Amino acid sequence: LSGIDLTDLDNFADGFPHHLFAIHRREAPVYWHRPTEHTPDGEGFWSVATYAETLEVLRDPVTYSSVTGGQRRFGGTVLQDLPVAGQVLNMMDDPRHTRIRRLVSSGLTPRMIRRVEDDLRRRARGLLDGVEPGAPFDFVVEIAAELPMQMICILLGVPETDRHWLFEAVVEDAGSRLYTYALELIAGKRAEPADDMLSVVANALSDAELYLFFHLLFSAGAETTRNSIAGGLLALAENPDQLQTLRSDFELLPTAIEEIVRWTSPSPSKRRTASRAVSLGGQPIEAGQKVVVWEGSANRDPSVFDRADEFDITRKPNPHLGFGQGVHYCLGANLARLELRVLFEELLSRFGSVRVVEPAEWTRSNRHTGIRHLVVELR
Amino acid sequence: SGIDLTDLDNFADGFPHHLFAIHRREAPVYWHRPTEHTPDGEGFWSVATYAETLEVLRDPVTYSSVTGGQRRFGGTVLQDLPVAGQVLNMMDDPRHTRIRRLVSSGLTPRMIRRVEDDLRRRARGLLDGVEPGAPFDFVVEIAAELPMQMICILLGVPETDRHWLFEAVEPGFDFRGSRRATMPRLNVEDAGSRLYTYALELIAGKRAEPADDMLSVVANPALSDAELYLFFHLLFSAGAETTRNSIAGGLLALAENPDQLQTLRSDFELLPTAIEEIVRWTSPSPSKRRTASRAVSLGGQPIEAGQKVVVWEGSANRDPSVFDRADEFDITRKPNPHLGFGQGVHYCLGANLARLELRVLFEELLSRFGSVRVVEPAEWTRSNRHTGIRHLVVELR
Ligand code: HEM
Ligand code: HEM
Structure with missing residues (x-):
């Protein structure tokens, strides 16, 4: 570990570096990572690679805050302290967290879920019908990015005419145009309430807080869900025999989808801040210190998962942390x-x-x- | 009652002086109800006269640049922004005094001459290249570059990085065919962005090897890294954008007042006074917001703690009860106590630049x-x- 820099993104340029995390789990499940030139804020942090300790952190939101702790003015849930800590649902603690989480979940109605599903079915069929068998094409750009972006356009109530602002955002100007358009859409929901999640929250927060919420969802669909779809396809391609088994019996799909989420772990790390002295993995953490958990590593911890480094679509049980755990558990897991x-x-x-x-x-x-x-060929 | 100061169509053709003449006449201090265009869907007090504008600016305790009442955060634009309290212009005492003094300490005589020497050579070179009589866009070809270079020099940005940085940090952007600008943001998608990474590496370098520039002074509560990034951005919006706009606006005013143009160019002793009239006339930064920290009466209106107050220096600067012939450009105007650079504890730190x-x-x-x-x-x-x-688009002869 002394020679390993988990903040050096050259180590993450080729996929999640599972080999480094095997070393981390073996050598020191919880350890103090000193800052390097690559470390946000030039500040060290406790790094947590095993499942039991990751789960322990996620399950104690009072000790391990998603906002801040000690003398630290702002924190949040990435390694860089952000002034928007405390202002968006996933970087909030009780009591405001519980209130806003319930307001957000109140927008995920059965009719909204059906609206998304009906559109998803129609679109997936259209896109797959358009594939030319045997001809190479980029599955990310043509299929994996498209479906969940359309899902979040439905949840947020973005009209077809205006969807390009969102696609274009996945340059600084592209970001500013997304921001400006989002603020226009939010004001529009205030003027004319609609039956969608953005309206629910806007009409219950400042526009700035509504933008943070908009972007959280946009990113969850446009990026995280897209990543699970692309990685699931790659995993199945690398395991043709399982692909065949799954193709022969779709009743295997629910268990296979959990294995895709464990395997892909599209959101592989989270930061918290200690609010008080506490021990974790037998090490002493002080109020104010940063703690980074690596669900991407926890999800391959052989103490918990048999043959953890193998993709197995029949895997049971499968208590993965790919959607989090505890009070911030992913609100979009079923979507x-x-x-x-x-x-x-x-x-x-x-x-x-x-x-x-x-x-x-x-x-x-x-x-x-x-x-x-x-780039894939489908036959 | 039919004017919407938040509808940017009213501003699409320049500052709407006619609307603000109405505002000063009918109601110097006015509760502006929210419309579809109003940030946060929340009304605000609108202040259009000079005297009442100064009552607000001169009282930073009652009219906070951070927040007030029960409001979570406010700042100095109409929209509530979470960077309130984290960037110099949206700070109050005691932190504001300490950071303003610190930033100011970077404006050494040496730095001023560094800026002046570079500005002289660049301006001379650009104007030397003008083909007399040939049309060109003054904003893009001349006015845009100069203040961007000035900021790069204050911040100690290497010359070799400036081509890249200019394209990245340019405050303006196109949206639906019009140019817009924003205040610096630091939302989740901005964390470790390419510009965030560049800026904090530049800062790291100056912490390792302190340099003779303003970013080194400030980087060596003190400003967190997040706050240093917002400060880096602030100088390009607050300093480069406004100065570019005063230059283009000053040329337009001179073009529209050919007799003033002749008087000025035939006696450069008049420049100092001419430049203050350019700032008054152009008022590149024409509005500011504050948040009331207690109940207070302003222009006979009962403001409540937490409520938004917007002052319009762009309107104050043409208040005919303070400026004679307020609606006329006069390069000899004296006195000229304009509010183009603000007034009081937040008075523009870059006014002399x-x-x-x-x-x-x-x-x-x-x-x-x-x-x-x-x-x-x-x-x-x-x-x-x-x-x-x-x-x-101008022709120069
Ligand atoms: C495979 C796709 C996805 C994965 C892997 C994923 C993962 C996660 C994780 C790990 C968290 C916990 C954050 C923390 O502990 O700090 C979370 C939270 C959240 N997710 Fe997702 N997510 C996915 C898709 C979605 C979608 C489609 C939505 C749309 C509703 C969504 C909405 C949210 C929200 C609103 C939160 C914040 C919950 C809270 O903080 O109370 N996610 N997600
Ligand atoms: C014509 C050009 C400029 C105009 C019209 C202008 C205008 C203003 C105004 C009206 C304020 C008051 C803000 C408030 O009351 O909330 C201000 C503050 C400020 N300006 Fe300027 N400015 C110009 C150029 C510059 C330049 C060139 C710089 C730096 C190089 C600069 C840096 C600042 C800073 C740092 C503040 C905040 C000071 C504080 O809050 O203590 N400005 N400016």
Whole structure:
């Protein structure tokens, strides 16, 4: 570990670096990572790589805050302290967290879920019908990015005419245009309430807080869910025999989808801040210190998962942390599973041959594990 | 009752002086109800007269640049922004005094001359390249570069990084075909962005090897890294954008007042007074917001703690009860107690750099050119926080 820098993104440019985390779990499940030139804020942090300790942190939001602690003015849930800590749901603590979380969940109505599902079915079929068998194409740009972006446009109530602002955002100007458009959409919901999540929250927060919420959702669909779809396809391509088994029996799909989420772990790390002295993994943490947990590593901890380094679509049980755990548990878990189920039903219905014909290209990040391009041939 | 000061259509053609004449006459201090265009869906007190504007600016305890009442955060634009309290212009005492003094300590005589020497050579070179009589866009070709270079020099940005940085940090952007600007943001997607990474590496370098520039002084509560990034951005919006806009706006005013143009260029002793009239007339930063920290009466209106107050220096600067012939450009105007650079504890820290940029630019321009024709209608930045020209196509002879 002394020679390993978990903040050096050159180590994450080719996928989540599982080999480094095998060393981390073996050598020191919890340890103090000194800051390097690559470390946000030039400040060290406790790094947590094993499942039991990761789960312990996630399950104690009072000790391990998503806002701040000690003398630290602001924190949040990435390693860089952010002044928007305390102002968006995933960087909030009780009592305001419980209130806003319930308001957000009140927007995920059965009719909204049906609206998303109906659209998803129609679109997945259209896209898969358009595939030319045997002809290489970039599955990320043409399919994996498209479906969940449309899902979040429905949840947020973005009209077809205006969806390009969102696509274009996935340059500083692109970001400013997304921001400006989001503020216009939010004011529009205030003027004319609608039956969607943004309206629910806007009409219950400042516009700035509503933007943070908008972007949280936009990112969850446009990036995290896209990453699970692309990585699920890559995993199945790398395991053709399981692809065949799953194609032969879609009743296997729910268990397979949990294994895709464990395997891909698209959101592989989270930061918290200690609010008081506490011990974790037998080490003493002081109020104010940063704690980073690595669900991407926890999800391959062999203390918890048998043959943890193997993809197995029949895996049971499968208590993965890919959607988090505790009071901030992912509010979109069933929507993500829905996206994966519909896509793989439709894809595996038509194709039982998936070949990746160029090396996968990955996003360079230790906060997201994602594939930027994945050229495949489907037969 | 039919005017919406938050509808940017009213600002799309320049600052709407006619609307603010109405505002000063009918109600110097006015509760503006929220419309579809109003940030946060929340009303605010609107202040259009000079005296009442100063009552607000001169009382930073009652009219906070951070927040007030029960409001979680406020700041100095109409929209509530979470960077309130984290960037110098949106700080109150006691922190404001300490950071303003610190930033100010970076403005050494040495730095001023460094800026002046570079500005002189650049302005001379650009104006030397002008083909007399040939139309060109003054904003893009001359006015835009100079203050961006000034900021790079204050911040100690290496010359070799400036081409890249200019494209990245440019405060303006196009949206639906109009130019806009924003205040610096630091939301989740901005964390470890390319500009965040660049800025904090630049800061790391100056912590390892302190340099003779303002970013080194400030980087060596003190400003957290997040706050240093917001400060880096602040100088490009607060300093480079406004100064560019005063330059383009000053050229337009001179073009529209050919007799003033002749008087000025035939006696440069008048420059100092001319430059203050340019700032008054153009008022590049025409509005500010504050938040009331207690119940208070202003212009006979009962403001409550937590409520938003917007002052319009752009309107105050043409208040005919303080400026004679307020609606006329007069390069000899004296006295000229304009509010273009603010007033009180937040008075512009860069005012003398702005005056320097305007001085050098106009010495170089007017000594060469006595004829300035605007050959198309000016296009304006769509904003009520910045008054500025997007394009100004001119012929110089
Ligand atoms: C495979 C796709 C996804 C994965 C892997 C994922 C993962 C996660 C994780 C790990 C958290 C916990 C954050 C923490 O502990 O700090 C979370 C929270 C959250 N997720 Fe997701 N997510 C996914 C898709 C979605 C979607 C489609 C939505 C749309 C509703 C969504 C909405 C949210 C929200 C609103 C939170 C904040 C909950 C809270 O802080 O109370 N996610 N997600
Ligand atoms: C014509 C050009 C400029 C104009 C019209 C202008 C205008 C203003 C105004 C009206 C304020 C008051 C803010 C408030 O009351 O809330 C201000 C503050 C400030 N300005 Fe300028 N400015 C110009 C150029 C510059 C330059 C060139 C710099 C730096 C190089 C600069 C840096 C600042 C800073 C740091 C503050 C905040 C000071 C504080 O809060 O203590 N400005 N400016």
